[PDB]
Design a protein around this ligand. Structure first.
Ligand SMILES: *[C@@H]1O[C@H](CO[C@H]2O[C@@H](C)[C@@H](O)[C@@H](O)[C@@H]2O)[C@@H](O[C@@H]2O[C@H](CO)[C@@H](O[C@@H]3O[C@H](CO[C@H]4O[C@H](CO)[C@@H](O)[C@H](O)[C@@H]4O[C@@H]4O[C@H](CO)[C@@H](O[C@@H]5O[C@H](CO)[C@H](O)[C@H](O)[C@H]5O)[C@H](O)[C@H]4NC(C)=O)[C@@H](O)[C@H](O[C@H]4O[C@H](CO)[C@@H](O)[C@H](O)[C@@H]4O[C@@H]4O[C@H](CO)[C@@H](O)[C@H](O)[C@H]4NC(C)=O)[C@@H]3O)[C@H](O)[C@H]2NC(C)=O)[C@H](O)[C@H]1NC(C)=O
Ligand SMILES: *[C@@H]1O[C@H](CO[C@H]2O[C@@H](C)[C@@H](O)[C@@H](O)[C@@H]2O)[C@@H](O[C@@H]2O[C@H](CO)[C@@H](O[C@@H]3O[C@H](CO[C@H]4O[C@H](CO)[C@@H](O)[C@H](O)[C@@H]4O[C@@H]4O[C@H](CO)[C@@H](O[C@@H]5O[C@H](CO)[C@H](O)[C@H](O)[C@H]5O)[C@H](O)[C@H]4NC(C)=O)[C@@H](O)[C@H](O[C@H]4O[C@H](CO)[C@@H](O)[C@H](O)[C@@H]4O[C@@H]4O[C@H](CO)[C@@H](O)[C@H](O)[C@H]4NC(C)=O)[C@@H]3O)[C@H](O)[C@H]2NC(C)=O)[C@H](O)[C@H]1NC(C)=O
Ligand SMILES: *[C@@H]1O[C@H](CO[C@H]2O[C@@H](C)[C@@H](O)[C@@H](O)[C@@H]2O)[C@@H](O[C@@H]2O[C@H](CO)[C@@H](O[C@@H]3O[C@H](CO[C@H]4O[C@H](CO)[C@@H](O)[C@H](O)[C@@H]4O[C@@H]4O[C@H](CO)[C@@H](O[C@@H]5O[C@H](CO)[C@H](O)[C@H](O)[C@H]5O)[C@H](O)[C@H]4NC(C)=O)[C@@H](O)[C@H](O[C@H]4O[C@H](CO)[C@@H](O)[C@H](O)[C@@H]4O[C@@H]4O[C@H](CO)[C@@H](O)[C@H](O)[C@H]4NC(C)=O)[C@@H]3O)[C@H](O)[C@H]2NC(C)=O)[C@H](O)[C@H]1NC(C)=O
Ligand SMILES: *[C@@H]1O[C@H](CO[C@H]2O[C@@H](C)[C@@H](O)[C@@H](O)[C@@H]2O)[C@@H](O[C@@H]2O[C@H](CO)[C@@H](O[C@@H]3O[C@H](CO[C@H]4O[C@H](CO)[C@@H](O)[C@H](O)[C@@H]4O[C@@H]4O[C@H](CO)[C@@H](O[C@@H]5O[C@H](CO)[C@H](O)[C@H](O)[C@H]5O)[C@H](O)[C@H]4NC(C)=O)[C@@H](O)[C@H](O[C@H]4O[C@H](CO)[C@@H](O)[C@H](O)[C@@H]4O[C@@H]4O[C@H](CO)[C@@H](O)[C@H](O)[C@H]4NC(C)=O)[C@@H]3O)[C@H](O)[C@H]2NC(C)=O)[C@H](O)[C@H]1NC(C)=O
Ligand SMILES: *[C@@H]1O[C@H](CO[C@H]2O[C@@H](C)[C@@H](O)[C@@H](O)[C@@H]2O)[C@@H](O[C@@H]2O[C@H](CO)[C@@H](O[C@@H]3O[C@H](CO[C@H]4O[C@H](CO)[C@@H](O)[C@H](O)[C@@H]4O[C@@H]4O[C@H](CO)[C@@H](O[C@@H]5O[C@H](CO)[C@H](O)[C@H](O)[C@H]5O)[C@H](O)[C@H]4NC(C)=O)[C@@H](O)[C@H](O[C@H]4O[C@H](CO)[C@@H](O)[C@H](O)[C@@H]4O[C@@H]4O[C@H](CO)[C@@H](O)[C@H](O)[C@H]4NC(C)=O)[C@@H]3O)[C@H](O)[C@H]2NC(C)=O)[C@H](O)[C@H]1NC(C)=O
Ligand SMILES: [Zn+2]
Ligand SMILES: [Zn+2]
Ligand SMILES: [Zn+2]
Ligand SMILES: [Zn+2]
Ligand SMILES: [Zn+2]
Ligand SMILES: [Zn+2]
Ligand SMILES: [Zn+2]
Ligand SMILES: [Zn+2]
Lengths: 210, 210, 210, 210, 210, 210
């Protein structure tokens, strides 16, 4: 309500949960005038100023104003251990600097419980069938759910937003629609869940009479 | 060489790699006399004295002396982040206290590569067959390898000690011997590897036409 | 639900807000059997074990069980800066230790706004009158409200529990009932509010033609 | 004695004692030549370099030289908890960098005791009278004393510099001169003292039969 | 003035300046009654409670009272880097605990300058002669001065207490009296100075045509 | 193997062992193209970015490429206490940044033992003679050995590289060749060893009948 305004978004859950990826916190300044084109960002991790952020190139919004975005890459462990990320924004149209802070949801982590369901007898009169994955009992709400078969990703799924349950955990459901034939032919499908409360240092390779 | 002596052992790799378990560092004092029965342990984590250790009940060794053991439970993250554990031992037979320190091997972690092999044609003339799991390219050397089938553990395996390779990584091999019939009947077997460089926040549940 | 149980209470707001006082966190273990009389408390400040707690003398509850209380004195600045206090409780009736953690409410502090009101014309037909103190706009909810006149405390007041308002702040009201005569004779009454968002390093002494 | 020279000044006591204000440490470089116009400042808080300082625009001194000023805003709590502020100054006329450090006076804080005195009978034969405020027993010496009446500031006062007393505390006196009539008419005057050893989280609102 | 009282002494300068030695801070409680024999010491290093102190056995003073001494061994680097050592003392005769804190003198270290002088012509008419060692310009005042000849210590010296000079440094003088004959026969004597501002990682071994 | 490459060198042992000197860690980027002239260095001390490094002016190598050098001055105590220095290098020819880290050798410090030897009878038939200094038993390997006579440096010496001994310590030898006459005339020569395990706060001044 009145000035250029700032919003501060956390990383994608998938990015926080795969050590191979690069999670980032994103600081977005909107409603900046052509009069005052330039914006200065200062970034802090638990109050200590850090220097690795990258400002994306500013770009005119169709309502005359500019939108400027700074992204800060965060360390996998730092984010999940609860460090606080602050974005401070400075601008000629803005008599005092504005600051916003973000960090991971606080509270005891709770492990998702995962249940799958094959299509109904009803469901299988159609050319497509839907496979269901119910995921309950998790905290915090940040989660990523995907599907695979035969070591390859299956992307024709829809997943609901986590809904808070009666016990303070979250719940969601994912549905993957495939060709009935693919299901009929005995292909195995996998609902894959990534969540901070799953935590392991394990892989495996399997062998059979082939 | 001369006095009661102390040895300081790291936790089991399996215990460091499963967040559900309780890894401990163990401090063992041997060659203590009946004259001076009592031993005092002080324990330090990066130099800060901590109080959670538990001394097991002292017990006569068959060469007249006593053996006393203190165990300190370590935090999963602390161990893997390289904190240093010191055990200081004090004893009436010991004019000055002795101290020993341990911590995880230092150096860039490198991920194991895992390869399985079915039995040879030679191998299958016998009532038993052996399945092979080769694991290379890992650092540090701390690793745990096990086997399973049908969601249950297979414990009839032998695994070699990690051997340093020409590139500074480690290598080992595990062999699981089972009844040829069990292999013939198409049961799937899994070589499971736990190592710090595997690190994930992932589970899955699979479904097929059953 | 099943065992000896533990509750962990914060200090009194007055104690946290007067640097002269001694705020304490209190850890209470109930449902302990005569069988296992003794309880061990470990206390931690942001995870660092501390040693200054004092256990009050255990005392039989009228339902056969014992109730044991440990109190830890906390530093004025530590509490208000958000340090986390953990109480771990150990007991022969309790196969594993139980732990609870407490800390000050998190969120931006917001300053109380204070308004007083004299009695209504209605109100003053009676031998007593009531003075009203409305306090709004404060966060967190921890607050202490009292009254005084002529440099002496007035303790015949009733104060409501803070109620969350539509904007995420808290609100309450305090009423002090005094003899109508005392109000009539022009005595000045003061509603006094202590809250973390009031913060000053100020005193004054006043002088007039006396 | 020889070169451009640097002086490093603490914040104003009033600024350190009102959480609403912005205390700053000020680093002043004098005797800089037109030859070497530019000066680089590095600033450190307990040895950690910080980036928020602002250099005021350099300005010719009437003896040919330049005077350059950097100001660093300090956090209320940091200053009063004793953090050390260092200013390092670099300049083409200056073969090596110069550094200066400042921090709050060390020693146990001691609370001011405040006493007021009305004018003498002598004093009141004149058109003006003087009101006296004696403040003793305080440590450290940083203090701010002001006056008010009727919720408005009274600025016609003179206050002595703190003088070290026989017990290692400091003492001062403040005198406010007002029109005898204003004193005669029963206006209340307040001597207000701000000092780190006063520390409260208290406000009040007063009510009377009006 | 009134109660059992506590004094807290720093380590000996020699002990702080030789890494082979064991510097200790010593906390002494006097004026304790036979009524309340026992004293509890808590010790803190920069506010963190530590456990390595040793209480010497309490001992009756000839004025009916007891004197109890706790000594805490300090780390060479910790002391010289300015860590603060606190001793808190608790006693049945003492309604509240008393605490004292000590640390090394603060201020920029300044290196001693050392000058020797042979005996006067006057001086050498006597059977003994005195050798003089003047040491100036050092800060802080903690210093240890000794003498040697032929790789063996010379202990017949007297050294003055450091005296503050006009520039804020300290000064002292040491005199070693030996038999005139020993000086006559060409023996080399060495004034040895230990001070924190001397700091080296150097030794040497010398060789000549022997 | 493929790209511009980076090497990261520790300070000179002499520079780490004399508090008067300025030890630096040096980060060298080679194989940079004229196409992408500019290189960005980020430097970290135990993971905290620091700003005091200085980039030397880039300079063409005779194989068409450029060589760029950044030097970071390190604190005497920091280096010897084991802090880790990281150099991160960024360049248009280099699709991702490269990083290297260095720190002092880890392991218990062990003090050098120093032995000198005069020339053999054989050796002294020649116009020059050689003096030998054997230094053993030291850890880590960083060491500086030099020679002096009559308070002046003797620079005509050759010193071997430290060689690892059978017990995990290092050994070396230094030989100083001088004119036989200088040795004959009874001049004293000194082998001087600097090593972290020598550590003192000692100087001396000597006096004799002159
Ligand atoms: C002039 O025009 C401006 C431009 O807008 C136009 O742009 C055109 C191109 C076109 O798109 C037009 O349709 C559009 O109008 C306009 O700017 C807009 O201003 C709005 C009002 O100020 C902004 O509204 C806010 O939006 C927040 C959510 O934003 C996300 O979702 C919207 C769509 O729903 C999307 O448009 C945004 O781009 C944004 O998407 C997210 O983007 C981030 C950043 O990139 C992504 O995260 C990063 O991205 C990468 C991607 O690979 C990677 O994932 C990184 O790792 C990751 O970090 C996200 O993935 C992406 N998400 C999604 C879902 O898409 C709202 O949350 C916010 O609501 C809050 O504020 C309200 C009042 O200000 C308040 O009433 C409300 O309750 C809420 O308040 C918060 O609520 C919390 C809980 O309820 C509380 O706990 C908080 O305390 C509380 N906080 C506050 C401060 O109140 C808000 O409504 C709008 O985003 C912005 N448009 C854009 C494009 O940014 C401008 O206003 C116009 N001027 C006028 C009309 O005068
Ligand atoms: C056997 O008998 C036992 C003894 O009880 C008897 O004792 C007799 C003498 C007599 O009093 C009898 O009437 C009495 O029955 C019995 O023990 C009792 O067990 C109960 C169930 O387990 C306990 O219930 C809990 O009580 C909490 C509040 O306790 C305070 O208030 C009650 C009265 O309302 C009072 O009786 C208590 O003493 C306690 O008073 C506080 O005491 C503390 C500690 O001294 C004070 O703080 C300190 O004190 C000093 C004082 O100078 C100074 O101020 C210090 O600085 C300060 O630190 C407080 O000032 C004082 N407060 C008040 C108001 O008086 C409840 O909060 C708690 O509720 C939670 O748990 C429920 C389930 O376990 C759950 O359903 C509920 O939702 C809630 O859960 C929490 O909710 C939060 C928000 O909603 C969430 O965020 C949390 O996550 C969530 N947590 C959990 C774990 O769920 C609970 O009901 C009872 O206190 C206890 N009695 C006593 C005396 O301690 C035993 O059970 C019997 N066995 C049987 C029947 O088998
Ligand atoms: C060329 O000309 C230069 C310019 O000067 C001219 O400028 C004209 C415009 C006009 O003003 C002329 O009259 C003037 O000559 C000239 O520069 C001057 O050089 C002097 C010598 O080097 C400087 O002397 C030092 O002054 C210190 C005190 O300075 C304050 O007070 C004077 C007046 O008394 C004032 O003029 C200064 O501006 C300064 O005022 C303070 O300013 C600061 C910074 O802005 C304020 O603090 C900040 O300000 C804002 C304001 O809103 C806000 O409050 C912020 O939060 C806050 O941080 C202060 O409020 C303000 N205070 C006051 C009272 O006004 C002396 O302390 C210092 O003494 C020390 O050094 C001596 C030797 O160098 C030494 O002998 C002495 O003992 C003392 O030493 C210290 O003593 C301590 C205890 O006793 C020890 O513990 C210490 O260890 C010890 N330290 C040292 C290093 O020894 C010193 O005399 C002079 O300030 C400077 N002029 C200006 C304007 O800055 C230049 O020298 C000329 N060249 C020639 C002749 O060749
Ligand atoms: C009952 O009897 C009690 C026992 O005393 C008797 O014991 C007999 C056996 C016999 O000795 C009798 O003669 C004797 O009377 C009696 O206890 C005594 O109470 C006194 C008053 O309360 C104590 O006075 C204080 O003494 C301090 C100095 O003490 C040292 O020096 C004296 C001799 O000068 C010596 O007797 C002490 O033992 C002590 O010696 C030091 O001992 C320490 C500890 O072992 C050594 O350090 C350690 O030791 C080992 C050794 O190998 C190793 O070196 C460790 O590493 C090391 O840590 C020292 O080496 C050793 N030093 C020396 C020189 O020998 C005074 O400093 C102190 O003065 C302060 O307090 C006054 C008021 O309380 C105040 O007015 C004064 O100004 C000063 O105040 C301080 O001043 C500073 C600067 O000026 C300020 O910055 C401070 O802020 C300020 N502080 C305060 C609090 O004010 C004080 O006078 C006396 O020591 C004590 N006796 C003993 C033996 O301990 C008891 O009082 C009697 N009851 C009655 C009469 O009712
Ligand atoms: C194009 O041309 C480029 C320029 O080179 C030419 O320059 C001309 C002017 C002329 O000199 C020509 O002859 C020359 O060819 C060329 O660049 C070169 O590339 C090489 C290959 O990439 C580089 O090789 C590396 O050299 C390291 C040692 O370098 C020092 O020693 C050499 C001579 O032996 C010297 O030439 C260097 O300048 C360097 O000297 C050191 O310099 C530093 C920095 O200034 C000093 O330290 C600082 O200096 C100041 C001085 O006052 C002060 O002391 C500071 O405080 C201090 O910090 C040193 O004092 C000084 N030392 C000496 C002794 O002089 C090798 O260590 C390195 O080996 C490692 O890498 C190999 C593979 O990359 C690997 O196989 C090998 O095993 C080893 O690997 C390491 O081994 C460790 C233990 O065994 C392991 O623990 C490690 O994990 C492991 N690490 C890795 C990554 O494997 C390497 O061979 C060469 O230095 C470089 N030339 C220059 C001048 O920098 C370019 O390649 C050409 N392109 C082509 C042909 O396509
Ligand atoms: Zn920085
Ligand atoms: Zn892990
Ligand atoms: Zn402890
Ligand atoms: Zn992880
Ligand atoms: Zn304050
Ligand atoms: Zn406070
Ligand atoms: Zn050193
Ligand atoms: Zn030292």
């Amino acid at each position: 309500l009145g000035g250029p305004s700032v919003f501060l978004f956390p990383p994608k859950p998938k990015d926080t949960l795969m050590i191979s990826r690069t999670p980032e916190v994103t600081c977005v300044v909107v409603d900046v005038s052509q009069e005052d084109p330039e914006v200065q960002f200062n970034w802090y991790v638990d109050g200590v100023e850090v220097h690795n952020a990258k400002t994306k190139p500013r770009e005119e919004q169709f309502n005359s104003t500019y939108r400027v975005v700074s992204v800060l890459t965060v360390l996998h462990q730092d984010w999940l251990n609860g460090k606080e990320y602050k974005c401070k924004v400075s601008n000629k149209g803005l008599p005092s600097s504005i600051e916003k802070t973000i960090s991971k949801a606080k509270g005891q982590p709770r492990e998702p419980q995962v249940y799958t369901f094959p299509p109904s007898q009803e469901e299988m009169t159609k050319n497509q069938v839907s496979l269901r994955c119910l995921v309950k009992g998790f905290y915090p709400s940040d989660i990523a759910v995907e599907w695979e078969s035969n070591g390859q990703p299956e992307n024709n799924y829809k997943t609901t937003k986590p809904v808070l349950d009666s016990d303070g955990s979250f719940r969601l459901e994912s549905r993957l629609t495939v060709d009935k034939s693919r299901w009929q032919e005995g292909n195995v499908f996998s609902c894959s869940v990534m969540h901070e409360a799953l935590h392991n240092h394990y892989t495996q390779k399997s062998l059979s009479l082939s």
